[PDB]
């Protein structure tokens, strides 16, 4: 009865193809020449860095590097609030609690580590050691102060409970390494990447994937939710950013350019959802328009590749940081 | 410029000083990563040293050089994604033994990459007594084309070593080799010699004058 699957697939193909009919709102003015400049130089790290996150105060950002140290900077005055020494040196992700009391990170150790900030003794320490996965971790997010959502290399995504310390549920079905899981603003749905050019939305309560989007040719590496909580964009090693809408169930705007031949490492939207930031595996940070489909924004520096970039909740500034151990704040 | 952020800033400077001290202390050692393929490989080497489902790091001590050895053995996930972080590592270790010789092309695959190129490879042939006792008997075969060589023994071993090599398409690579019988303690010494040699080569390449 496997042929029924490939006939149903043609059915849904015709369905999506018919539900759509580029040539709309093209008359709007272009964003124009957009240029950002460096305002701060966060130069505390020693080795390559991978990920960073913004707190809800839009003041403190935490980044992780191969040296195994987490730094809570003061973006205003370039100070160092805390320096956490890690147990496992190899890390690929970090996360900041919405309440600002906890910080979490994980990597090749296959265990998510959660830290505490506010304490009587005035020193940071571990809280829980989540150990359910058998593969390398990719990213962690906080649904709230009590629940964490993570995505490992076992083609599986699991939701935990810090106080319980056990996997309350597990999501699976991607049949490939899942990377860069980003929560939605509604904090009730999310979409995760995969190694087979596939993206799936998931339900935080029911426990099964709702939709499965396709259409890309190679591995994808980044994904993030739109501010409206009704769309998302995905980056991939094919130097292409593709925008998908759950309502449309089809790709909307394929950003491309002949000159660029590289990959993609991280993406993030803007406060109003008009600037589509991205970080390439090159010596720049390419910036694209929301739906006008033009390679407008370009950012020079720094020397090495680019790994991560994250926009603040309020949009006052943007942050960057990569393998050269330097972090720049562009305003 | 205000009372208390003056204290905050001096705290920040103390943190920076402590961080720099820790970094200069930590970067002093040397790092070798071994990713033996297949089976019957790296187990003997890791056993020759004198909470699961994760990479295991082994720390060594030899002539005031303690070594940090990482083996991604339990990683069931794809190599391309987590393989890259090891970029700034002095030497790699390669173990093979003794058909099912896809390790031959795997060696070529790891030796040729868009990054990671300028690194020497220390490959081991840890099963030598087994091969010898297999070659006194005539399997023979050899299931290779145009071998056209003497059956036993050093001739066949040298032909094998010529194979599985010569795929270095770049200069300034110093591929090493050894004949391990899974019963000798010389592995640490030859590893140390290879490390010392690559450090000297590196230093010479640095102005350089190379």
């Amino acid at each position: 009865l496997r042929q029924e699957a490939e006939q149903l697939k043609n059915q849904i193909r015709d369905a999506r193809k018919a539900c759509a009919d580029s040539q709309i709102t093209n008359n709007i003015d272009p964003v124009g020449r957009i240029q950002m400049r460096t305002r701060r130089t966060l130069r505390g790290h020693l080795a390559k860095i991978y990920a960073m996150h913004w707190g809800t105060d839009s003041r403190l950002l935490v980044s992780a590097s191969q040296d195994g140290k987490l730094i809570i900077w003061d973006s205003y005055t370039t100070n160092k609030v805390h320096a956490i020494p890690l147990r496992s040196s190899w890390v690929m992700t970090c996360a900041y609690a919405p309440s600002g009391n906890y910080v979490a990170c994980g990597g090749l150790d296959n265990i998510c580590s959660i830290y505490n900030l506010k304490t009587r003794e005035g020193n940071v320490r571990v809280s829980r050691e989540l150990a359910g996965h058998t593969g390398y971790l990719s990213c962690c997010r906080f649904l709230d102060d009590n629940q964490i959502v993570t995505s490992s290399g076992d083609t599986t995504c699991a939701l935990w409970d810090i106080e319980t310390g056990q996997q309350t549920t597990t999501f699976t079905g991607h049949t490939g390494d899942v990377m860069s899981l980003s929560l939605a603003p509604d904090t009730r749905l999310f979409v995760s990447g995969a190694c087979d050019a596939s993206a799936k939305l998931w339900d935080v309560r029911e426990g099964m994937c709702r939709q499965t989007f396709t259409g890309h040719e190679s591995d994808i590496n980044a994904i993030c939710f739109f501010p409206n909580g009704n769309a998302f964009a995905t980056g991939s090693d094919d130097a292409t950013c593709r925008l998908f809408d759950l309502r449309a169930d089809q790709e909307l705007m394929t950003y491309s350019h002949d000159n660029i031949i590289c990959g993609i490492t991280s993406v993030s939207f803007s406060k109003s959802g008009r600037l589509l930031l991205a970080g390439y595996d090159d010596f720049n940070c390419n910036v694209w328009d929301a739906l006008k489909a033009d390679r407008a924004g370009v950012l020079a520096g720094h020397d090495n590749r680019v790994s991560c970039l994250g926009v603040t909740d309020d949009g006052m500034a943007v942050a960057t940081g990569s393998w050269d151990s330097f972090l720049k704040i562009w305003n | 410029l205000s009372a208390e952020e003056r204290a905050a800033l001096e705290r920040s400077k103390a943190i920076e000083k402590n961080l720099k001290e820790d970094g200069i202390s930590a970067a002093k050692d040397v790092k070798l990563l071994l990713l033996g393929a297949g089976e019957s490989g790296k187990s003997t080497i890791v056993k020759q040293m004198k909470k699961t489902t994760g990479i295991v790091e082994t720390h060594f001590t030899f002539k005031n050089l303690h070594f940090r050895l990482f083996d991604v053995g339990g990683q069931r996930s794809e190599r391309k994604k987590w393989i890259h972080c090891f970029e700034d590592v002095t030497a790699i270790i390669f173990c093979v033994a003794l058909r099912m010789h896809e390790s031959l092309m795997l060696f070529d695959s790891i030796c040729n990459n868009k990054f990671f190129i300028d690194t020497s490879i220390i490959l081991f042939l840890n099963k030598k007594d087994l091969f010898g006792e297999k070659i006194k008997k005539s399997p023979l075969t050899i299931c290779f084309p145009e071998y056209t060589g003497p059956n036993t023994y050093e001739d066949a071993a040298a032909y094998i070593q010529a194979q599985f090599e010569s795929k270095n398409r770049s200069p300034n690579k110093e591929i090493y080799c050894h004949m391990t019988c899974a019963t000798d303690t010389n592995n640490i010494q030859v590893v140390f010699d290879a490390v010392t040699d690559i450090i000297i080569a590196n230093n010479l390449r640095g102005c350089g004058l190379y």
Partner: single-chain antibody
Framework: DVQLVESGGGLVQPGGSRKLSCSAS????????MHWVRQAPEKGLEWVAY????????YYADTVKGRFTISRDDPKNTLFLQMTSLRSEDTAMYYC??????????????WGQGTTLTVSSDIVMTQATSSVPVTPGESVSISCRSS???????????LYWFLQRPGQSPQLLIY???NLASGVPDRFSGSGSGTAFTLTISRLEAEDVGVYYC?????????FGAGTKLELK
């Protein structure tokens, strides 16, 4: 939890010598800046001296220079303060207070027990009156008159409040005159303007009666207000 035990005081003849030791436990003492505060046996508060967490910065009060010295040793978790050439005015009981300074910090959070000691410009704030009759279940208002505006360019208001239980060590109520300290009921709420400072207490109860104090941190040296005491008539 955190405990501060100090015992180094005693009746010393004027012109003699003595040393003070405040023992710290239950927290990372090595990463905290430490404070000395004395209280007169009848009334009044004042700042004695302060030592940085890294011990790279030292301060003393106006009438302390040349007579008293301070020093701390991290491995011993104790602070050393030397009383030299003590005067007849020095007869007062002391307090050793911990502090910490970074973004979003709450200094002077925990106070010690104190020692008994006997013998034989800068902005100043005043509180008046020092005694108001109150009733349970009724909100009260407290104000501390200040000399110079404390609103720094950083958008902050460097001022702190305190409450001393009758016969017990004082503890903090509001830090930076706008926030809430840990373990404090939400009824309390600091307020005030750049120069005028007001304290608000809603639903006062019979266990919150005591003496209030106002203290500024914009510039060294520190200073303390006259204070206000309540009653349950």
């Amino acid at each position: 939890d955190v405990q501060l035990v100090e015992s180094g005081g005693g009746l010393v003849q004027p012109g003699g010598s003595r040393k003070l030791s405040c023992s710290a436990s239950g927290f990372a003492f090595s990463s905290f800046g430490m404070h000395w505060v004395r209280q007169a046996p009848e009334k009044g508060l004042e700042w004695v001296a302060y030592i940085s967490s890294g011990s790279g910065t030292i301060y003393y009060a106006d009438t302390v220079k040349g007579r008293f010295t301070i020093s701390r040793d991290d491995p011993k978790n104790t602070l050393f303060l030397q009383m030299t050439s003590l005067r007849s005015e020095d007869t007062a009981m002391y307090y050793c207070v911990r502090s910490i300074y970074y973004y979003g910090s709450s200094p002077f959070d925990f106070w010690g027990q104190g020692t008994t000691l006997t013998v034989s410009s800068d902005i100043v704030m005043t509180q008046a009156t020092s005694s108001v009759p109150v009733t349970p279940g009724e909100s009260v208002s407290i104000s501390c008159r200040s000399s110079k505006s404390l609103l720094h360019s950083n958008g902050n208001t460097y001022l702190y409040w305190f409450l001393q239980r009758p016969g017990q060590s004082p503890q903090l109520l509001i830090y930076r005159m706008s926030n809430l300290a840990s373990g404090v009921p939400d009824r309390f709420s600091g307020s005030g303007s750049g120069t005028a400072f007001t304290l608000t207490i809603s639903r006062l109860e019979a266990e919150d009666v005591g003496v209030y104090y106002c203290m500024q941190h914009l510039e060294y040296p520190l200073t303390f207000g006259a204070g206000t005491k309540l009653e349950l008539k």
